[PDB]
């Protein structure tokens, strides 16, 4: 993919687990910036499913926006998830 395209991420739930955490960045100290990740979970979605590395963006979970307030809260949407998952995330600028 390219710098920019917004690609969507739409995989199944494996042991209930997605396998993926999100951290407080949008609710540090700015109006609306955005979220990053915590770290990956390579033992469910992330592994087999993969797509799912570090430092990328999400913009949003099912649905639910996070940009605005979801640094733990988050954690818990993700986890109440059917079968199928939406996750859309960002390539973000700067893989470090």
Not at 2 to 7: A, E, R
Not at 40 to 57: F, L, M, N, T, Y
């Amino acid at each position: 993919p390219k710098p920019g395209d917004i690609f969507e991420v739409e995989l199944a739930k494996n042991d209930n687990s997605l396998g993926i955490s999100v951290t407080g960045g949008v609710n540090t100290s700015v109006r609306h910036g955005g979220i990053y990740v915590k770290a990956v979970i390579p033992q469910g979605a992330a592994e087999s499913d993969g797509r799912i590395h570090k430092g990328d963006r999400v913009l949003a979970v099912n649905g639910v926006s996070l940009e605005g307030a979801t640094h733990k809260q988050a954690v818990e949407t993700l986890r109440n998830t059917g079968q199928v998952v939406h996750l859309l995330l960002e390539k973000g600028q700067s893989p470090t």
